[PDB]
Design a binder for this molecule. Structure first.
Ligand SMILES: *[C@@H]1O[C@H](CO)[C@@H](O[C@@H]2O[C@H](CO)[C@@H](O)[C@H](O)[C@H]2NC(C)=O)[C@H](O)[C@H]1NC(C)=O
Ligand SMILES: *C[C@@](*)(O)[C@H](CCCCN)NC(=O)[C@H](CC(C)C)NC(=O)[C@H](N)C(C)C
Ligand SMILES: *[C@@H]1O[C@H](CO)[C@@H](O)[C@H](O)[C@H]1NC(C)=O
Length: 233
């Protein structure tokens, strides 16, 4: 996360750390005790059994008592996720067990089915354990940045018309570079206490205004998410 601050340890309990080969790879969120929502691209060319979902963490490197580590029993990627286009960059993860709810391991709510994406200007927040700059610099723990929803017609121009109706953008509330970076994918864009977006792609350099931060418009997927969840009891 660029242009962000470190969060109060355990102040965002829904945050999941998807890790492959010891190293933290992506972000995600706890939907239900057994379910985690993430970016479909995180699992591309990975063997699931090399992966763990870590909940209740702040300093990922430290083995905290608050931490709860689970395996991926099953991964449901959006059937229509397209590499090259990056559309439908969403997936669901069924853990090998249910997470024990506590003050450090908690749920995040999706918008209703009756939901349009947040308006251009809306104050939103993006958390993650990914890089803090374009120099591979690591955060001291879970970081968050305060962002504001950017007009899609504006975002689509910057992106040379590569944006689909199921994507949504952010921009910093000021002149500084604020947003997501590498290893922040899958993590949620919280708007009005609901997961409105999910960290998908950005340009080359982090928070660069010329290439605004693109997210998956969660509301457009709510129906699918539940379908999958009720499918697997
Ligand atoms: C859930 O999945 C994980 C990953 O497949 C299981 O793996 C254990 O994880 C620890 C480290 O976290 C390893 O040292 C053990 O060797 C792994 N055990 C097994 C059985 O592979 C984890 O055990 C699973 N938990 C449950 C309750 O099934
Ligand atoms: C997957 C996630 O870790 C990143 C987060 C954005 C960091 C960008 N500074 N997303 C990507 O790496 C996606 C790739 C997926 C195929 C959508 N791609 C991009 O961000 C860009 N097009 C370039 C960084 C390659
Ligand atoms: C973005 O622009 C292209 C080309 O003008 C258009 O086909 C597409 O529907 C637009 N998408 C959005 C999200 O506005």
């Amino acid at each position: 996360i660029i242009g962000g601050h470190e969060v109060t340890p355990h102040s965002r309990p829904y945050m999941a750390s998807v890790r492959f080969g010891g190293q933290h790879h992506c972000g995600g969120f706890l939907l239900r005790a057994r379910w985690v929502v993430s970016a479909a691209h995180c699992f591309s060319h990975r063997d699931l059994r090399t992966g763990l979902v870590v909940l209740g963490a702040h300093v990922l490197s430290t083995a905290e008592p608050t931490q709860q580590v689970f395996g991926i029993d099953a991964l449901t990627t959006h059937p229509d996720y397209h590499p090259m286009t990056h559309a439908n960059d969403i997936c669901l993860l069924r853990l090998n067990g249910s997470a024990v709810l506590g003050p450090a391991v908690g749920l995040l709510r999706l918008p209703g089915r009756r939901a349009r994406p947040p308006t251009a200007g809306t104050r939103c927040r993006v958390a993650g354990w990914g890089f803090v700059s374009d120099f591979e610099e690591l955060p001291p723990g879970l970081m968050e940045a305060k962002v504001r929803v950017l007009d899609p017609d504006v975002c689509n121009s910057s992106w040379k018309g590569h944006l689909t109706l199921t994507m949504l953008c952010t921009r910093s509330g000021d002149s500084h570079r604020r947003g997501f970076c590498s290893a922040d994918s899958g993590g949620p864009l919280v708007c009005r206490n609901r997961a409105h977006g999910l960290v998908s792609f950005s340009g080359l350099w982090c928070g660069d205004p010329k290439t605004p931060d693109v997210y998956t418009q969660v509301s457009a997927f709510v129906a699918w998410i539940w379908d999958v969840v009720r499918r697997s009891s």
